[PDB]
């Protein structure tokens, strides 16, 4: 009944209002240390993150889960610095996203399990900071390597009780294959969040996953390139569905009886080197509220659409607490 | 005038016997810091490196050029530590190899140039250690991104006088395209070494590059899977040609008049996370001399084949001094 944060162990009740899928910075391993001027400076990136998290805190956020892996250039010392300055708890992730270097892509299930367990049980790098979640990814049918990662992540979660959260291409229904592999491994679905599930309108796909016991990550609510259809890179990243369309899936899953199984987030960030240059000007145009978009815009939207307060609090406070608390079931 | 090393500037004459294409550790960016246990420990990797460099130093080596880039997991603090304990100069590299992550792959020629220039003119990470060479790579026909890396490398070289050195798939004569792209940016061939050129017996290919003024990197002389050909991953890394066969290309380019354009090395390492697990067990059986292989085995072999000591001196001392001097 402790959750590891970048500033150490917290009790479950200190987590409070939680954003389960976010990033301080979306980058690549070693990149922030090797070319900090890409973001202006390391301090400029940190200050920008602190401004954004302080705003999110003022709107009610107390914890974000940063699901940046090794290969997304997770820098836990940055995360501790930003956490302390903004007085927002940050949970760090182990696992791998879909840009693993050779030194990872050539590893066995056993080797990957050791690496994830290291980051949970011992610490990340030389920092003593322990991960509180495992992040994995597919983009369509799993590559052989991605299957090995799913299996290593299941093994790490069985050994530690730490949960797994996933990147999907929701248009390819990637959750069904991820689910199959987790269930062959023996991982309980209540320890798994199928992410980017708000990228699709296929409610049959989502209820069938929630029927099997999975948590459903509706985690990119503000992602929309509506108004910027002529920006190809921005439309490929954000899609042409509205924030309201995404948000209404939250209502839709409540209405199907699965309020218990929803996790809601922004999937935002304060820098993004692992995409096209200047993407942050597009993102900050699209959603100037940043990580404060869920509490400032989506919570009131869901209320005016009929969702009880009590339900929003189970989704933003109780679901995340239940999910993050280390347990096998 | 001055060459940058991981322990600061040295004068040209301090370089001495120089291995122009080596590695302390072949890895991936951030990997040694995130999982040092893959190598046993950071201490165990440093111990083995210090032992191998001291082995090389005893055989006459004074300087190595570690052509590990960002994406090969170059750790210049490790390089500094082993350089100092072994009393061997290490020149560090900028550039990109063929495992760039997205944060590099999506960058323009102009962005890449700024990055390379940072590592040459300011420093690597927060260390103040500056690169003395630019490493680039193709594996066959250049991808669009690798063409951008070659162009950024040429611009960084023209701005600083620092030389460029390449990875090739020699069986696809990559040096030909590399040379065209460099010349299109105005880079002089005398600032370029076309590497892994000993990976095939293709002297038409090598002499024509050398006739255009390129330096030819015969840099994998001890690489051979002969005797362990049934190990598929060893054979794919090391090839099925003997070290003597590779070394005879050195004699061949000398015989053709190109002694002034040859650079010889081992392309060795002491750890290797960017290949299959336990590869070091194979490598240490194939070439236990490590980075001492050139001075202990190749030099005497070439002497016995009639190459003069003065030609061996120009190749191992003079050619690297001229190549590394910023121009
Ligand atoms: Zn994702
Ligand atoms: Zn994300
Ligand atoms: Zn190479
Ligand atoms: Zn090499």
From Swiss-Prot, chain A:
Pfam families: PTE. NCBIfam families: organophos_OPH. It comes from the Bacteria. Binds 2 Zn(2+) ions per subunit. Has attracted interest because of its potential use in the detoxification of chemical waste and warfare agents and its ability to degrade agricultural pesticides such as parathion. GO terms for cellular component: plasma membrane. Its EC number is 3.1.8.1. Zn(2+) 1 binds at residues 21, 23, 135, 267. Zn(2+) 2 binds at residues 135, 167, 196. GO terms for biological process: catabolic process. Belongs to the metallo-dependent hydrolases superfamily. Phosphotriesterase family. Its cofactor is Zn(2+). Its main location: membrane. InterPro entries: AryldialkylPase_Zn-BS (IPR017947), Metal_Hydrolase (IPR032466), Phosphotriesterase (IPR001559), TAT_signal (IPR006311). One of its GO terms (molecular function) is zinc ion binding. It catalyses: An aryl dialkyl phosphate + H2O = dialkyl phosphate + an aryl alcohol. This is Parathion hydrolase. Has an unusual substrate specificity for synthetic organophosphate triesters and phosphorofluoridates. All of the phosphate triesters found to be substrates are synthetic compounds. The identity of any naturally occurring substrate for the enzyme is unknown. Has no detectable activity with phosphate monoesters or diesters and no activity as an esterase or protease. It catalyzes the hydrolysis of the insecticide paraoxon at a rate approaching the diffusion limit and thus appears to be optimally evolved for utilizing this synthetic substrate. Homodimer. The modification N6-carboxylysine is found at residue 135. It is found in: Cell membrane. It is a peripheral membrane protein. The lineage of its organism: Bacteria, Pseudomonadati, Pseudomonadota, Alphaproteobacteria, Caulobacterales. Keywords: Cell membrane, Hydrolase, Membrane, Metal-binding, Plasmid, Signal, Zinc. It is an enzyme of class 3 (hydrolase).
